[PDB]
Amino acid sequence: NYEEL
Amino acid sequence: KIISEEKEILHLIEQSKRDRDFIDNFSKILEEKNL
Amino acid sequence: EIKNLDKALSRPERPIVAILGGAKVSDKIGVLNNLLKYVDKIIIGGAMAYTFLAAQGIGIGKSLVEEDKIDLAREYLKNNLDKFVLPIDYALAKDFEDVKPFYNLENTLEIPNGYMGLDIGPKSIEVFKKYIKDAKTILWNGPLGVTEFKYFKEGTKAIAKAITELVYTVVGGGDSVAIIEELGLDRRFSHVSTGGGATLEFLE
Amino acid sequence: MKNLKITAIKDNLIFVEGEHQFSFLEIIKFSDKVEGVVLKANDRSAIVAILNEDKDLNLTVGSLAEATGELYKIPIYDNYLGSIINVLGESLVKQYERTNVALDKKYVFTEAQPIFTRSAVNEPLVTGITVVDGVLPVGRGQKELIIGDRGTGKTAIALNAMLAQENTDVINIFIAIGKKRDEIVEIYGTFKKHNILHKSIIVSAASDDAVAARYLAPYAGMAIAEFFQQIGKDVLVVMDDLTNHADAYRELSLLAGIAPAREAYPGDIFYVHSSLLERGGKYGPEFGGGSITILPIAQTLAGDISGYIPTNLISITDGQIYTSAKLFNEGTRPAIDVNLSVSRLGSAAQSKFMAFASSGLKKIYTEYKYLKRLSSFSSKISNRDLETLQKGKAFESLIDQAEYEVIDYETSAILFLLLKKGFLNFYTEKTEALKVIIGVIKVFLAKDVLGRKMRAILVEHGIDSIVWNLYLNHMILPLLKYHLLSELQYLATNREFIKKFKDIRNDGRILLAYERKGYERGIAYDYK
Amino acid sequence: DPEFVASTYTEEEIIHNLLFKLYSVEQLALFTIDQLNALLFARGLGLEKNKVRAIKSLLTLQTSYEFMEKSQAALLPKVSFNPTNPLKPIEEKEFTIFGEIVEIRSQVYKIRIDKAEEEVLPKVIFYADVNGKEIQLEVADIFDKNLVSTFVLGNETGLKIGTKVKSKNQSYAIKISKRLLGRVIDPIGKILDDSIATPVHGNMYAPLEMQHDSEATRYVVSPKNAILETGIKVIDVLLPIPKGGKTGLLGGAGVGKTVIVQELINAFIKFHDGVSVFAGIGERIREGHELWKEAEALGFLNKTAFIFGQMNESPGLRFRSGISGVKVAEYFRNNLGKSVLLFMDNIFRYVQAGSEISSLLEKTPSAVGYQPTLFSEMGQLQERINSTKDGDITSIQAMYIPADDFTDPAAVAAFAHFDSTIILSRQLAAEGVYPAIDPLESNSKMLSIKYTSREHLDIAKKTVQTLEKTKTLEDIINILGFDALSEDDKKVVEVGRRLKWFLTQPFVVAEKFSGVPGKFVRLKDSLKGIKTILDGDLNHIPVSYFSFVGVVEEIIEKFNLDAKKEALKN
Amino acid sequence: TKDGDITSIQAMYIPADDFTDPAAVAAFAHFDSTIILSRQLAAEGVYPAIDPLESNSKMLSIKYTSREHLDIAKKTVQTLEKTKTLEDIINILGFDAL
Ligand SMILES: Nc1ncnc2c1ncn2[C@@H]1O[C@H](COP(=O)(O)OP(=O)(O)OP(=O)(O)O)[C@@H](O)[C@H]1O
Ligand SMILES: Nc1ncnc2c1ncn2[C@@H]1O[C@H](COP(=O)(O)OP(=O)(O)O)[C@@H](O)[C@H]1O
Ligand SMILES: [Mg+2]
Ligand SMILES: [Mg+2]
């Protein structure tokens, strides 16, 4: 996921 | 706006600590006055 | 014919890597869709690469862009992020004239004002060669640089040599077919499509 | 033309009076054959050291002399190769005839070329010694000192280095400073026997030659080397030895009247060696495109490397090969101290195959030496200790070779890889298995046409581990297995030999047939 | 006013200022591995093989106050450093003294003066012209009014009796400016990096003139108070380098000093964003060429000023290399207000050249044949490196100890000035341990509470204690076997082994030998890793995993990956 | 020369038992065979007091002797060196440590 990065 | 106020306060604290610990100008050291 | 566009588009052997060389971000959108749901690792070169750099927030200088699809690039990076390999080094010139190139030695990502991007630099060449070395399928489509200029065609010849010296390589673009004909790049590629809109539809 | 006259003769040094523009080391001519160099000078007088003497001419007070105005220039002649010569170019022992038309004249005291004329040293100079080739690499253009006590085998190492160039394109120049004449003649005979005489020059200044001649011999040798390098050649230079050269210079300086310094050597004893040794290196195509490799020799007293001259020579050179008397007593040949020797160049001076073959040999040797030293006191050792002892013993047995024995670069690399794989620990104290292995590998790489192809692949191509493993498991191991069985019969009874050699093709029939037809040991294919 | 603020900056200044650009984390998540690695290499943090770790490193570098200060200043009109007490160039004179050579020898020539407009001064330079080549002779002794003695600065070939010489009654001078960066010269200013000898544009300064109004000015100095960050785990944790002091690199031959020197040059130029001056004394031609070529290749050539007194040059020329390097550093601090990291190699050769010059000029040798003015000359060299209001001059000097004799007079003279000594071991290098720094023998004066924290001191003390104790116990292990240890001794030995192997590090310059990419480890990361190892947390990992890594997490990740592969294999 | 041989046997004196004396160093360069006598061995009663661990000979080559002689000489010198090393251990740590 983009948000996890 | 690049530097936040909190980080500026931290930098001021660190610079004050450095200026207190290591003194370059000898007129900044407390002297006892003869009486 | 069908042995590449149809037969080879069903059960590719991992790892699979694709190269798209073009000067328009909004000229290959659909291709991305079928590519991202088919191929994981993709090289991107050209003016659409500079559009992607503008989307990411990097400086672009006086390079040609497509301001309409900036948010489209942001969306294609947000959903999938560890897929694309954009170049780092960019040979630059003051204007469109093919003059002796100039480089940004420090912070190679940034493109300063008064310069436009036309071709990738030696660091980008080396990193692309490193990515090419570990591969099993090659799908070349278009020039990552600007082939029409003499002082801006080193990238295409270097990547062609890298793809040919070392697994199956092919060509899937009319511009790639032209570059191969003008440079002799059929040593490793089985065949070229030159489909244009037909190639885009077969790749969509 | 003569304008100087002799006024005194003290300590074999001539004192000349006359009005001239004297310069340091200027040549003063006393006759057609006799000449000297200026050590000190005034506005009207000078001190001259004679280079050579003539029986006919007897120099006295009042004899006239001519000041040439130039420094010493050595002439280059056709028959220098395969010859022993003076510092003046006279053929003491020659193999061919001299045309008497000099090809060139070189200044013996030329300044070294600056840093922009050099190129990176990246090619291996094959010494012919396994331990030097693998653990202490020497590259073309690298000055490498050989330092040790008397009778430890330094001259032997240098001679091995020159003999290993039999099949290469390197030119050998041997400079003898204060050496015995019989030893020089024996070295010339050794050159002749090994067919390296046609490209070797010896510049000889014996122990009873004039001191100026002994001082100038290395400079003349390096001038000849520079003549050969300026036309793009590779040259290997051996100086034997620079301690005698320093002694000769000290004698000259003390006789002249120069104030003594540390150990009574003149003040500039470091300069005369640094300026001499910095003239060797690798050069770019615009400045000759050649290379000069220097192997100076230095003698220490009871292992004391703290002397002035050894310290200077260690500070100047790129690496040091130490010869130990204790290792000579222990039976090591050559008695090279690996723990003390250093090579700053490293794998940069090795081929890719050799670098891959000798990755971690120094660490294994160090661990083995530590364990062997402590073995006389310890009682309990782990299994890793047993494997370390086996590998170290195999390494010691591998790096031992006879005198004037050249071992090929690729043979050394293959032996190193065999050791690293564990294939050389079955034998012990016999060292005939390793002898037949070396013979087989040399014949395979030198005679068999496919062996020649493999040799080229190993020389100019750096192969990966898989390709080398395929080579080892398909041609080397079967040949070694068959010939080890055929010449060491009891080896088959060894459990380790049977274990390591149970998954290799048994090609004994065809190789026995080739033995019957008379093919020499090592030719596996005759596909002409 | 973007146009106005950009009007005060040259195009090269904008190119440099593109480095100090702030990137938001939202943008940073969208970069690729290749772009992140390019950014890290441009900012000197070294390559990273993980995404989130690279973003964290970039954010940590960007969140620093100095980086934010530079980024904020990069969007403002140029402010010029106003030089107080600059270096004044030499004055313009004519050739006022004329004479000729009357006595010759090896390296020493006597000059008789015929036509003089003024009396000759000590240390002035006489110029001679032979075959279109210029030779400089430095004056040593003035015997009477019209007779002096001189020694050559360079090559003495071509000099003879009656060679006319002329002098301006001035010491030797060199051309200094910012254009000296990226060029290679010798102490007297001769070009050494090309055959056509493209000149260096600058002003002529005399390196032997200090330009002090009074001696009291030499006591207006600021004692060292700061620690320079190098990115090397062992140096940062155990041997802090003073900023404005002196660090000695000691060892035998082949220990690896020059690789450390190159790594420190690169780290100072890239990470610390400064100016580097290299002064080779008795520099081998091959090593000088190699170091120049790798400086060009690695990209720190354009910010380094090289001075090379070569090994084959006269001792007088070899002696002046340190003075010329010090003068260049003084110019780069006083005139431009930039912190300079000055590198010296090799100090032993400087001492040897001084001894040679003393012996040549007929002076009575001191003990062990050294010059009577040994300590005086060492002080003369080392006393011009200091820290003043204008900036810092840090020195990192490599020394060769002959036969490991630390009581040699040259070494005894050198230790009088070193603020931190880093001693390399040939045994430790032979074990494959690099950078092969001996932690027990080396020590730093900056590992106190005046400069470091309580945590740093505690970690350093515990590390040294553990290493000494495991060194003691290893002999017992070797003799009596690993079983003879007690229960606590086994844990101590394992912790010590893992600590010793964790201190190794791959350098970005040493990629030529082993082919392994280098790394840059911050002080906090090294402290956290050593703290984790000291507690015994990673005692379940084989020792082979601790070798040549960057941070503590790499070992854990590699061990977890190997365990996963082993679990999948069966 | 071809007219005949001149075989030289020479005795060299070592002042103050200092084998680094310049005269000894100069003489070492000319001896094909070098035989060094020890004062400690003579004190122990060994006669001749020849120290084989300090001497050397260039006639120990395959060009002049057989393989067996070379092997025997090398083994003898190696054994004497090992014994000399072990005598220090015996002297300090006693005999039962071996
Ligand atoms: N590889 C070798 N195997 C066996 N003997 C060897 C070997 N190398 C040298 N020797 C022997 O060692 C002795 C010394 O040889 P060499 O002339 O090389 O010594 P050196 O160190 O130059 O001595 P010196 O001080 O007399 O010049 C000779 O007897 C020679 O035969
Ligand atoms: N960090 C390192 N990694 C690998 N090798 C090194 C390292 N540092 C030094 N070396 C080795 O040292 C050799 C060069 O020695 P050098 O740096 O000149 O040491 P010194 O200058 O102290 O003699 C090289 O061959 C290299 O292999
Ligand atoms: Mg010899
Ligand atoms: Mg060094």
Numbering used by the authors:
A (entry chain U): 45 to 49
B (entry chain J): 125 to 159
C (entry chain O): 179 to 344, 348 to 385
D (entry chain E): 1 to 528
E (entry chain B): 202 to 771
F (entry chain A): 589 to 686
The authors write:
The twin motor exhibited a rectangular structure with dimensions of approximately 350 × 250 × 150 Å and at least 24 polypeptide chains with a total mass of approximately 1.5 MDa. Notably, the two F1-like ATPases were inclined to each other by approximately 5° and formed a dimer with pseudo-twofold rotational symmetry and several accessories. The F1-like ATPase comprised a hexameric ring of two alternating subunits and a central shaft subunit, identified as MMOBs 1660, 1670, and 1630, respectively. In the hexameric ring, nucleotide-derived densities were observed at five of the six subunit interfaces, despite the isolation and analysis of samples under nucleotide free condition, indicating the presence of endogenous nucleotides as reported in F1-ATPase. The subunit attached to α, forming a “bridge” between two α3β3γ subcomplexes, was identified as MMOB1620 and named GliD in the present study. The three densities protruding from the G1-ATPase dimer were identified as MMOB4530, which was previously annotated as PGK. In addition, at the interface of the two G1-ATPase monomers, the N-terminal regions of G1-β3 and G1-β6 interacted with the NBDs of G1-α6 and G1-α3 of another G1-ATPase monomer, respectively. These interactions suggest that the β-specific N-terminal region plays a role in the incorporation of PGK into the twin motor and stabilization of the ATPase dimer. GliD contained a globular domain and an N-terminal long α-helix (H2), which was only visualized in the dimer. The two H2 helices in the GliD dimer aligned parallel to each other across the H20–H25 region of α, GliE, β-NTD, and β-CTD. The GliE subunit, which is bound to only one side of the dimeric G1-ATPase, creates asymmetry in the twin motor structure and may contribute to the unidirectional nature of the gliding motility.
In the gliding bacterium, Mycoplasma mobile, a dimeric F1-like ATPase forms a chain structure within the cell, which is proposed to drive the gliding motility. The motor is formed by dimerized F1-like ATPases with unique bridge structures and is referred to as a twin motor. The F1-like ATPase unit associated by two subunits GliD and GliE was named G1-ATPase as an R1 domain of rotary ATPases. Structural features of the ATPase displayed strong similarities to F1-ATPase, suggesting a rotation based on the rotary catalytic mechanism.
